[PDB]
Symmetry: D2
Subunit: 311 residues, 4 copies
């Protein structure tokens, strides 16, 4: 551990937080009202070490949707219950070029971090049981990852995403055309389960616990229990490292060097292997679709604490 | 007219027909039973001059679905009722590269001869009225083009295409995502109208009359009536010339030089400007998706009668 | 012939010429001084019917480089001496998608109308003999096409194109890498021959005679002699129809419907099959790289005289 | 350090070495004789810890060309003398899609690990001085990285690469066309310097010392001296992680999780951050172009010692 004095570290976290606060650029997602609602000034950062030590600053208790931030999580869950080999017969393992085809060279979604990928992954989890049951399974799972902290749902977001995601339906039908789903999959039913997962709510605080779980080889820092298999955690981290920041993934892997995953709600699930989990949140996104204050913060954290993968 | 002696010409048509008959290669489409049914040995060629003169050989009275062969026709109808400018605010005017994106540089289907294009075009025809009425409108229209000859429908084909076209639905949703349809379009309703049009039935004989209509500047050779506007006919011919033979369009424009349009049913709508209309039909298709006997025939017709656009 | 009264037709040509004259937009090519020199106001149109009848208006006697306009010509020459089959073992027969790869699916230049294509074609003509001799062979050939009218050379242009064409050298080496040239080809020597051909000079008047030759099935309208084989002329026309106006080829084939070929010098070699040959010239080019006044003129000519391929 | 007992670790290295030895597949590069020469049975593995501890097994003293393995090294050198900002005004920082364009969206080579990238990087090192001097500069540099161990040159390889690299010349001219080189660069001279660098020779033993240098934050394990800046080492490692195994980079980052770089000579420069440097060598390559025995070994090393970046 490179964090000898937590107290001092925390003091630095608040300095970075304050430094980022001055970054007012970016635009709040507004393709649906449930996202337009949010104030551009909300800005929260929560830390949770592998030690179990916590620290928050800013709006770390205001609920918000995981959206794309859930992709790493449901993928981790799939590997946990099905293993690397099986999950990857349906989804790739690397970033794509850039326009934006749904499938790769082998008629499989490039990776679990893109829509097509997350949709296929969603179709692997808890096959057989009905949607209601599948959703409880993932919720219970997310609860263990967060050590029983805040994990809600947003029905308004769910209804808006469903009655608006024409591109996800396009992807749904295309994958069904290319036989990308396991035998006998209710494609439309899957997209529904998919929209629901994107609607799960968390707070910087509860999310940081989930990130810390991934930073602690699958053991929840605040309960000590094994939630995800070592295999599942290593895969999730690798993929977050290469494709978790949309079109910014390259720049991010080169300059920040940490496993992260952004969401349109403005959140950024950050993981510092064997050190801590983190969740930055600020609604204003840049052109790439990442939280402006969040990206700023991440670069600052790595310059200051030499947390970069290769330091 | 390069056909001084119709009698002799006909004798040559039968020779080419017999020559093509020996081409047994190709595979009959079988993605649906209604197409698998067909015998690979069916082979028919019907001619209809701008003069009104007719001639058939082979299975020219066995009904079969137009399928893609209807694309040029419904496009002609759109230009006829809306004019070049309007129709092309929604669909392109040239062939694409090759994989196979749904939209081009300007978020419009490349041309009316590809699925995405034909789907958008379908959404322009007779806007407002219900589907049943739209279908009668096109049927009545196709009747005038065929001079009241055989124009049927295949409900079995229609039902199979609908409960099987996942890729067309994918295209449907994608176009709806990119705002490619006119304001307030029932996308799913349009795909239904689209599947129905693909299910319209004709015979080499009735189809050749439709082709002759396009070969006669919009006037049906056997009734003398104006069916399509000059503007509409010129557009349809240009596009059939550059993108009517799927991936073979280039080779076809270079070696045959005639406006044509193939269909998965094995038909090839051929037009020899100011001379005649033609419909070759033979279920076995090659890798490109064109009738094997039909392609052979077309090359032979141009070598023998110097009908190539630039002879 | 749709030109009953040449006198009246000529009167219309001058009206279109005057109408186009008002189009002052576009920018004169300036990648080399020999092209920057030209006045944006130069504008000439020369007609030469299959009959042998002539007519000029504007700056039809000011020499200018063929540049890309020579591509159709040297291609015609290759087919004439080697036949379709041989020439096309090295170059494609259709337009490409759009970035801009040097080779297609089969490691062959897409068509003779693009740089890579024209370079490969250049390597087929008069193999064996030295460059000086090859150049005389093509010059003598171009002379017959122009009926002995103006055909010059521009050494200043040649020297500038050679000491500046890094992209053509890149293409040269790439093709050499993919074994695109006939056995034992001096690649660098070929690029030199290529640059020279681009530097050949003509005038609207002499060029229109060359165009008329292609419009007359290979027979020079003003000498009556056979210059190009029927086979060679049909191929050249087909390719000019689909890929002779750079990225505008699609729009041009759909709206104008005539075999044409533009050049960076501002010229447009136009052919109206079995009617006449033409050469419009005006240095200012549009974004696509075609003569602004020339494009305007071509659209006007087709609207007024219904010369479109499918009228 | 996860290597408590070096003795035991070494015993495991020899077991993996022996296990890999049984992998006889792959084909020895043969585009030039200097590579065809090599026996498919040569197989060597050399380790060099950050501690300075060494260990070899197999043909670890047979000289071979770095080839692509030098790309990470000359890139490290550029960052060391010019800093991240400057070097990256000319070359990208991420993997590309897949065909294989020379430049990316911003007209810059995708990254330093691809030919176009390595060529641009080569043009940044020691600008001004002549080629002979530039080469000595890099040689002296490579010597410090190897702690003065074997670093040779192969004139036969150099001469063959130069008189055979048409694709590198194509790339050279294209980059020169797009103004990718610093002001006043002798492009052809640069390609020469480039071919020379690819011809530098090493042995598993000396190379492993170079890898260990990168594994030790820029300090040569066997001399203790600072050779590369921390900044330069972190960049080199990140890029080796994402694009050092050609088309296998994705699979490699996901399954092995270590910074590596392969070469057509059959070598694989491997780095285990803060632990050791390594060089596996075996001439037979797979379709991707990586050493077959080397790839096998790398997967085995990570399964056995949990060296994967995220374990
Ligand atoms: N591999 C793929 N090919 N086409 C796709 C649809 C278009 S977008 S994805
Ligand atoms: N222009 C287009 N971009 N993506 C498409 C979907 C993929 S396939 S079409
Ligand atoms: N087919 C082709 N692949 N790469 C090319 C070079 C790039 S540009 S052309
Ligand atoms: N960005 C690029 N565009 N064309 C290239 C040449 C072809 S290969 S690289």
């Amino acid at each position: 551990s490179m964090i000898p004095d937590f107290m001092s570290f925390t003091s630095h976290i608040d300095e970075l937080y304050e430094s980022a606060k001055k970054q007012s650029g970016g635009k709040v997602a507004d393709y649906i009202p449930q996202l337009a609602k949010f104030s551009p000034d909300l800005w929260g950062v929560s830390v949770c070490t592998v030690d179990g030590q916590r620290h928050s600053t800013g709006d770390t208790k205001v609920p918000f949707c995981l959206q794309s931030c859930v992709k790493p999580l449901k993928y981790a869950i799939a590997v946990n219950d099905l293993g690397t080999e099986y999950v990857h017969r349906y989804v790739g393992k690397e970033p794509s070029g850039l326009n934006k085809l749904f499938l790769n060279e082998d008629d499989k979604p490039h990776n679990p971090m893109v829509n097509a990928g997350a949709i296929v992954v969603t179709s692997l989890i808890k096959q057989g049981v009905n949607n209601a049951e599948k959703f409880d399974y993932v919720m219970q799972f997310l609860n263990k990852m967060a050590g029983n902290e805040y994990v809600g749902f947003s029905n308004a977001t769910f209804q808006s995403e469903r009655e608006s995601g024409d591109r996800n339906f396009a992807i749904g039908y295309y994958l069904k055309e290319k036989k990308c789903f396991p035998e006998g999959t209710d494609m439309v039913g899957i997209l529904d389960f998919y929209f629901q997962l994107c609607s799960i709510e968390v707070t910087c605080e509860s999310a940081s616990v989930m990130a810390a779980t991934l930073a602690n080889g699958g053991f929840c820092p605040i309960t000590g229990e094994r939630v995800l298999s070592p295999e599942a955690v290593r895969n999730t981290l690798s993929l977050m490292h290469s494709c978790g920041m949309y079109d910014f993934s390259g720049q991010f892997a080169f300059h920040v060097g940490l496993p992260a995953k952004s969401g349109v709600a403005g959140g950024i699930l950050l993981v510092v292997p064997n050190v801590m989990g983190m969740m930055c949140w600020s609604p204003p996104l840049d052109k790439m679709g990442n939280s402006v204050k969040g990206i700023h913060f991440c670069h600052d954290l790595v310059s200051l604490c030499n947390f970069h993968n290769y330091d």
